[PDB]
């Protein structure tokens, strides 16, 4: 599906950015704004100017998700972005720090965007990961699709709004206007950076702030004698809802793509785990 | 002066025995020397804390051993009311930092119970040398009903008074949205952190900003943590003074602050003073 990409940089790896552009263009995609690989106001305008980006059915790809989004949140024109996304929505995709903007979008107007690969980390990596490439196009091209993996957890079925992304970024939003108030959801979390104790401290905060227990289920993506198993065990000891581990999701070279704010059905059985996702915007045919 | 220290280890060994040795050689005494044995379980780390409600020897200094991870696990099981009740008469003088901030905060949230953010057994008393600055500032706070810390702080020249609070930034962040967040406004909030990358410091400071915590204080002091863009950015969002350069936190130089005490911040051109009162002291 040959597509139009529009690069945004709300958050040094220019060679990998070019390698990503070259791969996309070589494969017959077009890049709307190649010129912007040559400050606050300029990073801010990358986002606010999306409300005036009216190219048809466009994939808006975050270039990198190192830090910077947090500075922007109070100056983003949320209403104009939410208005934009009411018709021929941009298909907005990124991860890591980009999670904060994604959550902001959800909180102001249930705008669905894709927690998934970025130009530098994924598309311009030394090897393009096929698993990641597959799941990206899988999500953007199919109005209903299913992710399968060998998850670890109780056998169960839950259905609700899919949300989450990067754990630290989601924590950074508690207390603020940009925390989405989603209940009875399937909450998917990743943070491949952090020390286990920090992961635990953050999961606990989600617990004691009342976010985790109000969901229908919790899925943990990529994270890497006190280790991560102790953290899962302790969290499970607090929760009366299923917590499933083992999804390839986050900043590993393997990551699925997840439409935050879409509808999902989680089904975990002895045979393995399925997540069926629908309602997100797709490439049009 | 010569004191009784009672050790607690709700969080987290050579340096620990060296710290005990330094305290006992100076003529202090140390109870609960057995918390350096367990490697312990939730239940016992819990009991370190809950049993303080029945430690009634007066003028006792409860000293946290280390402030690595652990407290977060305990907060929902701590008998906060029994601790608040204990501290209304001949209160314990409870001192720690780092992870210990969370307990300190829970105490504030439950009863405006003052405690001290300052040295701990392993990091401070058991280091290669006992740092004289830190030593002086610990005893200054515990012995004097009114005392004044001075330093060459950087910020606007200003005078502000309110409830002093804060401690470790990440730990205070961990409490937003939970029952253990102190509800202090019009205060003097002092923050420090260790081994945080600048961008992580910024994210945390921004969260305190956007949750409405920073702008509701009278002032913000930054302790020990390149972060100049981080100070510049937060200053660009705040309408209240933000003073840097205090020696507070996890470096060998740290002051000791009585969280929940009354403070007057005075920053001038010739330097910064923080005048603190209302906290419990060693009584003679």
Q: Considering CB atoms only, which of B68, B75, B210 is closest to A176? A: B210
Domain ranges, residue A26: 1-145
Q: Does residue B18 sit in the same domain as residue B143? A: yes
Do B186 and B135 fall into the same domain?
A: no
* Expt. technique: X-ray
Residues 6+ apart with CB under 8 A from B162: B184, B186, B187, B188, B217, B218, B219, B262, B263
Residues B214 and B106 in one domain: no
Report the 10 Å Cβ neighbour count for B32: 17
Same domain, A124 and A207: no
Specify the length of chain A in residues.
Answer: 285
Residue A14: partners with Cβ closer than 8 Å, 6 or more residues away = A37
- Strand ranges (E), chain A: 4-8, 30-31, 59-62, 91-94, 113-115, 144-149, 156-166, 186-190, 217-220, 243-244, 258-260, 263-269, 272-278
In contact, B191 and B231? CB cutoff 8 Å: no
Strands (E) located in B169-203? 188-192
- A279 and A172 part of one domain: yes
Q: With 0-12 CB in 10 A as exposed, 13-18 as middle and 19+ as buried, what is B58?
A: exposed
User: Token pair for residue B158?
Assistant: 């200003």
B102 shares its domain with B167:
no
C-alpha closest to that of B140 among B270, B19, B254:
B254
Angle value at C-alpha B223, between B222 and B229, nearest 5 degrees:
50
Which of the 8 DSSP states describes residue A152? B
Domain's final residue, options B147, B167, B187: B147
* A171 interaction partners in chain B (CB closer than 8 Å): 173, 207
How would you classify residue A96: left for phi > 0, otherwise alpha for psi between -120 and 50, otherwise beta?
Answer: left
Same domain, A188 and A137: no
CA-to-CA dists, residue A224 to A117, A122, A228, A246, angstroms: 19, 18, 8, 12
Residues B152 and B250 in one domain: yes
The number of domains in chain B is 2
Whether the CB-CB separation of B65 and B122 falls below 8 Å is answered with: yes
Query: What is the rounded CA–CA span in Å between residue A220 and residue A240?
Result: 16
Q: Which residue(s) pair with B238 in the sheet?
A: none
A205 at the B interface (CB within 8 A)? yes
Residues B138 and B193 in one domain: no
Q: Is B109 found in the same domain as B1?
A: yes
Range list of β-strands (E), B155-224: 158-168, 188-192, 219-222
For residue B38, count other CB atoms closer than 10 A to its CB.
11
Last residue of a domain, one of A145, A160, A188: A145
* Co-location of B127 and B103 in the same domain: yes
Resolution expressed in Å:
1.8
Long-range contact list for A32-36, CB < 8 A, 24+ apart? A32/A4, A32/A5, A32/A6, A32/A7, A32/A58, A33/A6, A33/A7, A34/A7, A36/A7, A36/A9
Among B82, B114, B147, give the residue marking a domain's end. Answer: B147
Residue B60 · residue B7 · CB < 8 Å: no
Instruction: List the strands of the sheet with B146-151, edge to edge.
Output: B146-151, B271-277, B262-268, B158-168, B188-192, B219-222, B242-243
Q: B200: which chain A residues are within 8 Å (Cβ-Cβ)?
A: 168
Contact flag A175-B69 (C-beta cutoff 8 Å): no
- Are A208 and B75 an interchain contact pair (Cβ–Cβ within 8 Å)? yes
Do B9 and B142 belong to one domain? yes
A vs B, Cβ pairs < 8 A, gives 68
């Amino acid at each position: 599906h040959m597509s139009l990409f529009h690069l945004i940089a709300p958050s040094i790896k220019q060679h990998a950015a070019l390698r990503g552009i070259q791969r996309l263009t070589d494969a017959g995609h077009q890049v709307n704004n190649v010129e912007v690989i040559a400050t606050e106001t300029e990073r801010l305008e990358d986002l606010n100017s999306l409300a005036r980006l009216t190219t048809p059915n466009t994939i808006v790809l975050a270039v990198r998700g190192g830090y910077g989004a947090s500075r922007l949140l109070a100056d983003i024109d949320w209403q104009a972005l939410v208005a934009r996304q009411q018709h021929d929505p941009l298909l907005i995709c990124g991860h890591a720090d980009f999670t904060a903007i994604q959550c902001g979008l959800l909180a102001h107007g249930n705008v669905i965007t894709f927690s998934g690969p970025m130009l530098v980390a994924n598309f311009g990596a030394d090897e393009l990961n096929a698993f990641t490439e597959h799941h990206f196009w899988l999500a953007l091209r199919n109005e209903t699709f299913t992710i399968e993996w060998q998850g670890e957890g109780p056998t169960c079925r839950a259905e609700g709004t899919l949300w989450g992304g990067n754990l630290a970024m989601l924590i950074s939003l508690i207390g603020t206007p940009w925390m989405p108030k989603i209940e009875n959801g399937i909450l998917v979390l990743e943070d491949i950076n952090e020390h286990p104790f920090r992961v635990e401290r953050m999961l606990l905060q989600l617990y004691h702030a009342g976010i985790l227990p109000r969901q229908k289920a919790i899925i943990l993506g990529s994270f890497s004698g006190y280790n991560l198993e102790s953290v899962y065990a302790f969290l499970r000891s607090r929760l009366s809802i299923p917590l499933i581990t083992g999804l390839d999701f986050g900043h590993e070279q393997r990551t699925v793509t997840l439409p935050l704010g879409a509808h999902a059905i989680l089904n975990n059985t002895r045979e393995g785990t399925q997540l069926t996702i629908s309602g997100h915007p797709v490439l049009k045919m």
